[PDB]
């Protein structure tokens, strides 16, 4: 699941985106992213108011 926080990396917011962007143009996306948120813021604004 922490190799699926990449949507936040991516884108966011817006939605997704993308981016992608384109580039781009203007714008880019981024910015957008930035922007977104714002948105919301816006919303718130819206609411506030109303008016």
């Amino acid at each position: 699941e922490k190799q699926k926080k990449e949507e936040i990396l991516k884108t966011t917011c817006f939605i997704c985106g993308l981016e992608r962007d384109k580039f781009d143009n203007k714008t880019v996306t981024f910015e957008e992213h930035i922007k977104e948120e714002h948105n919301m813021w816006h919303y718130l604004c819206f609411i506030v108011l109303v008016k």
């Binding site: 949507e7 966011t12 917011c13 939605i15 997704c16 718130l44």
Partner: protein, 204 residues
């Protein structure tokens, strides 16, 4: 994708928261009271180290702060006698004051209305009842003291417990390990095992 819604719611919440946040507170809270929080962890470090020095006698043993209270040397020159008045007072006091006031004023109308809020007021539950559990596990409570320084012382407390038985037990320890359970909520992997742990203890 978603984102948104959631976101939205958340946002609203946021818104409210924012509103609250703004407002504021007063003073405040948040912080300064988080100084109080982290150094509360330092306090559990302390009842940790001193529970090692079980009540009766003893002045030969000891442990460095390391980078905070220099008053600890004063705390240990009368040692456990006034440890029936060191972790227990500064601990319960700093924590109830500081951390209840912040953890409740930062959030005390907020959780309304979402399930992550139901969980964070569950944090209100664990933190509050476990630590009043702790305050009730030293002071009597209620109150005491503290301041500085002184003085120291103490007283008581106690209350109730007992019835029936339970009649009389090892109240102090009760305090100890539940605090280190707070240290357990401090981080991660622990939760990891638990979660996959559901219909999996059945594998046991």
């Amino acid at each position: 994708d978603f984102f948104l819604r959631s976101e939205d719611l958340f946002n609203e919440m946021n818104w409210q928261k924012k509103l609250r946040a703004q407002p504021v507170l007063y003073w405040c809270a948040r912080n300064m009271s988080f100084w109080s929080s982290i150094s509360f962890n330092l306090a559990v470090l302390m009842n940790l180290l001193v529970a090692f020095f079980y009540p009766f006698k003893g002045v030969r043993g000891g442990t460095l702060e390391p980078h905070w209270s220099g008053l600890l040397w004063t705390a240990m020159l009368i040692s456990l006698a006034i440890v029936i008045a060191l972790p227990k007072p500064h601990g319960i006091r700093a924590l109830i004051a500081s951390t209840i006031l912040r953890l409740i004023f930062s959030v005390g109308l907020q959780p309304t209305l979402f399930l992550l809020g139901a969980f964070n007021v569950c944090n209100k539950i664990i933190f509050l009842m476990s630590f009043v559990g702790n305050c009730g596990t030293f002071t009597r409570g209620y109150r005491a003291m503290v301041l500085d320084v002184e003085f120291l012382y103490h007283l008581l407390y106690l209350l109730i417990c007992a019835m029936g038985l339970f009649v009389h037990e090892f109240f102090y320890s009760l305090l100890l390990f539940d605090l280190v359970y707070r240290e357990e909520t401090l981080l991660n992997v622990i939760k990891s095992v638990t979660r996959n742990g559901r219909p999996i203890i059945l594998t046991a």
